[PDB]
Each structure stands twice: as C-alpha cells, then as structure tokens.
C-alpha cells in the first residue's frame, strides 16, 4: 500500500499472508471462517503454499503465529486469465485455524448488497509502500 | 527495499464502474469493483487481500485486491474482485464441501 499507515497489530484479524514453499510472501487473503480463506485466483495458489494467520510483522518469528496447510484449492472456473475477471479462489485448510483475539473472520456480503460509490472502505496488506 | 514488514492499511473510496471505465475502459467487467484514485494505492504484494467496508457495526468483504496501475499510481483507481458478484459461488462451494 502506497500512502497508507501501519495497522494496529492484530486489528485486521482475518488478514492472512500466503507463503510459497520457500517461505516467500506472495499474496494476501482473508479468513471467512476457521476452515476457509478467500483470495484472488491470479495468485495461483497451490497446496504447497501455506496460510499464515495472526501475523503483523513479516520479520518476526513467533509460535503465536499459525502456519496452516492447504488441503485443497477451489479456483472459480469462471476466472478469465486474460481479463482477470472473476478473480477469486477459496482455500480449504487441512486443519482449522484457532480463532482468538488476533485471528477471526471477516463478514461476507449477500449478492444483492449495495456498497455505494463514494463509500469509504479500507484495504490492508504487506505490499510495497513505494513502487 | 520498499517492503513494509508490518501490515499496512489505507482508507479509500469506492467508485462506480462507469467512473472507473473513464480510466480503464472495457477492462472493467461487472465482477470488478474499483476503489481509490484518492491519493493511496494497493501495490505489489497486496494482491489477494481484502477491501472491507463497515456495515451494521461490522466489516464486510467487498473486494479482493486484483489488479491496478502499472506503477502503483495514487491517481488511478485500483481494481478489485467484486465479492457480491462471486459470493453465491462462495456460499455454494462452502455448503457442498
């Protein structure tokens, strides 16, 4: 995020970091319940990637961070790899995340909800802070 | 490096798809929602994470970070997967699995 700010540690408790098999953060995601994470289809997640819940600082090493294996990836079959439309994938965890103060779920909208143009929302992540 | 270490956040406005298409044209599809062009931007490594909006005292997932400016420009809207257009599929997948 460019021109953002440091989040309060643990205040976005559904935010997860997706790490490849070498330990490299490559994408974010969001817990929707103790067994499932929603992310983007373009991230190309596989069952050799790991879901990291309860993290805020990437350089920290703590047993209080949950590294959760992925049992199966559910890519939406409508995903268009050229236009990037329908950019969503579900990750079914092998073992359930343990919810706590720093690990919990985000709410999902209904397909009929209206989030009006002009509404102030928030985005979070460990992306670059400058290009 | 321009890597952050600690989790970042930013507040930003949702745009209408008509306004988003002023910049991005026909790249904007109905299952996309744009946000930003307000002085903040998502950038490399943010992909897949959340765009949340407060509704009834709680945060709801409205977008999934999808794609945007080549250079993370803060005057161009970011493009997110529009979760309302994809949540029936989410709910169907969870009910069957």
């Amino acid at each position: 995020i460019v021109n953002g700010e440091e989040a309060v540690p643990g205040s976005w408790p559904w935010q997860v970091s997706l790490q490849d098999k070498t330990g490299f953060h490559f994408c974010g995601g969001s817990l929707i319940n103790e067994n499932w994470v929603v992310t983007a289809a373009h991230c190309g997640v596989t069952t050799s990637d790991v879901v990291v819940a309860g993290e805020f600082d990437q350089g920290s090493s703590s047993e209080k961070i949950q590294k959760l294996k992925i049992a199966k990836v559910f890519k939406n079959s409508k995903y268009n790899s050229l236009t990037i439309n329908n950019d969503i994938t579900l990750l079914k965890l092998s073992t359930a995340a343990s919810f706590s103060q720093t690990v919990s779920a985000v709410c999902l909208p209904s397909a009929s909800d209206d989030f009006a143009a002009g509404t102030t929302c928030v985005t979070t992540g460990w992306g670059l802070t400058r290009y | 490096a321009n890597t952050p270490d600690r989790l970042q956040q930013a507040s930003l406005p949702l745009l209408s798809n008509t306004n988003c298409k002023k910049y991005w044209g026909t790249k904007i599809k109905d299952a996309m929602i744009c946000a930003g062009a307000s002085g903040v931007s998502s950038c490399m490594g943010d992909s897949g994470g959340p765009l949340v909006c407060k509704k009834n005292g709680a945060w709801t997932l409205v977008g999934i970070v999808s794609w945007g400016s080549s250079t993370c420009s803060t005057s161009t809207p970011g493009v997110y997967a529009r979760v309302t257009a994809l949540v029936n599929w989410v709910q169907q997948t969870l009910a069957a699995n």
């Binding site: 700010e5 989040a7 309060v8 540690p9 643990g10 205040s11 976005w12 408790p13 929707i32 706590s100 103060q101 720093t102 919990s104 779920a105 985000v106 709410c107 999902l108 102030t120 928030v122 | 956040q9 507040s11 949340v52 005292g57 709680a58 945060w59 709801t60």
Partner: peptide
Amino acid sequence: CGVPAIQPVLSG
C-alpha cells in the same frame, strides 16, 4: 464475524 477484538485505528 467482522468485529475485531483489537479495534483498528483509521486515520481516514
């Protein structure tokens, strides 16, 4: 869902 036990602080 959606109510962090640790409230986020938004600058806006």
